[PDB]
Design a protein around this ligand. Structure first.
Ligand SMILES: CCCCCc1ccc(S(N)(=O)=O)cc1
Ligand SMILES: OC[C@H]1O[C@@H](O)[C@H](O)[C@@H](O)[C@@H]1O
Ligand SMILES: OC[C@H]1O[C@@H](O)[C@H](O)[C@@H](O)[C@@H]1O
Ligand SMILES: OC[C@H]1O[C@H](O)[C@H](O)[C@@H](O)[C@@H]1O
Ligand SMILES: [Zn+2]
Length: 257
């Protein structure tokens, strides 16, 4: 199946998923000089105070922290978005070394990792229906750079030893995703896609300008996860990022002047 190796990685995905060569694929390079302030953007509202985390899963590609999205709790509204988008899960992409790992780039600069908070548009009723719609999803992307530790990440780091291999999960209740945000909500936005198969072109991307800082020790623990299942030869879960894709007929808008 698809992955991030030489023989099954991003350059091969198009054979099974021909939309990989589509017109609104993600991630992209964010050219900060060409990005334009958009006065039609409304204030962005990240409303995570009632979030209910449930579980953390190693899915063989990354780890997902899953939320109870059976009702409106942690949601994203405003900015470029029409209506209410419910948080379903977050996950990260990261590198084998600190100089790469992010999916989006900023003037071609690669960050050590990237956090994706995934939300679906409640007008479509369920995630599977939302991924049949052009405006079905909103992903809030946050860059990670290595410096000081992020206290609100440590609970994630410390559970990873219990989900080392593909298919393992653990209870992960009472986790507050507000502890993963930077101070500023300045952002860039554009229309794109999922960055993994099935690569569906359903996503409004909202990429925060301000990175969060995490410590070297925190990201080193990400890199101890495994792509493989239990009992199989160890393949470290590193470099689980797709490179930047052609911008094509898109513009990146900025929330800030
Ligand atoms: C429709 C099948 C499930 C899709 C799950 C998924 C995949 C990729 C992303 S990402 N990395 O763009 O944020 C988010 C969510
Ligand atoms: O436990 C994590 C978070 O869960 C939410 O449901 C609560 O409303 C928050 O106060 C709490 O920080
Ligand atoms: O025709 C002028 C318009 O061109 C578009 O490509 C830009 O997004 C707008 O900001 C601009 O007003
Ligand atoms: O908040 C996420 C998790 O953090 C820590 O692992 C706690 O021990 C656990 O009870 C909780 O589920
Ligand atoms: Zn992602």
């Amino acid at each position: 199946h698809w992955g991030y190796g030489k023989h099954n990685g991003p350059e091969h995905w198009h054979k099974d998923f021909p939309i990989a060569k589509g017109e609104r694929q993600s991630p992209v390079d964010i050219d900060t000089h060409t990005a334009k302030y958009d006065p039609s953007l409304k204030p962005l509202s990240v409303s995570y105070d009632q979030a209910t985390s449930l579980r953390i899963l190693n899915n063989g590609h990354a780890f997902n922290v899953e939320f109870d999205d059976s009702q409106d709790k942690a949601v994203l509204k405003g900015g470029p978005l029409d209506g209410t988008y419910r948080l379903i899960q977050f996950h990260f992409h990261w590198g084998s070394l600190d100089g790469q790992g992010s999916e989006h780039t900023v003037d071609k600069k690669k960050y050590a990792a990237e956090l994706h908070l995934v939300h679906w548009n409640t007008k479509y009723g369920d995630f599977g229906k939302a991924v049949q719609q052009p405006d079905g999803l909103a992903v809030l992307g946050i860059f990670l750079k290595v410096g000081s530790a992020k206290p609100g990440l440590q609970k994630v780091v410390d559970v990873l030893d219990s989900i080392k291999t593909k298919g393992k999960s653990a209870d992960f209740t009472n986790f507050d995703p507000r502890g993963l945000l930077p101070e500023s909500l300045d952002y860039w936005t554009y229309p794109g896609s999922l960055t993994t198969p099935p690569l569906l072109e359903c996503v409004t991307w909202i990429v925060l300008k301000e990175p969060i800082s995490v410590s070297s020790e925190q990201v080193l623990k990400f890199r101890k996860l495994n792509f493989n299942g239990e009992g199989e030869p160890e393949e470290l879960m590193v470099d689980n990022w797709r490179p930047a894709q052609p911008l094509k007929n898109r513009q990146i808008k900025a929330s800030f002047k």
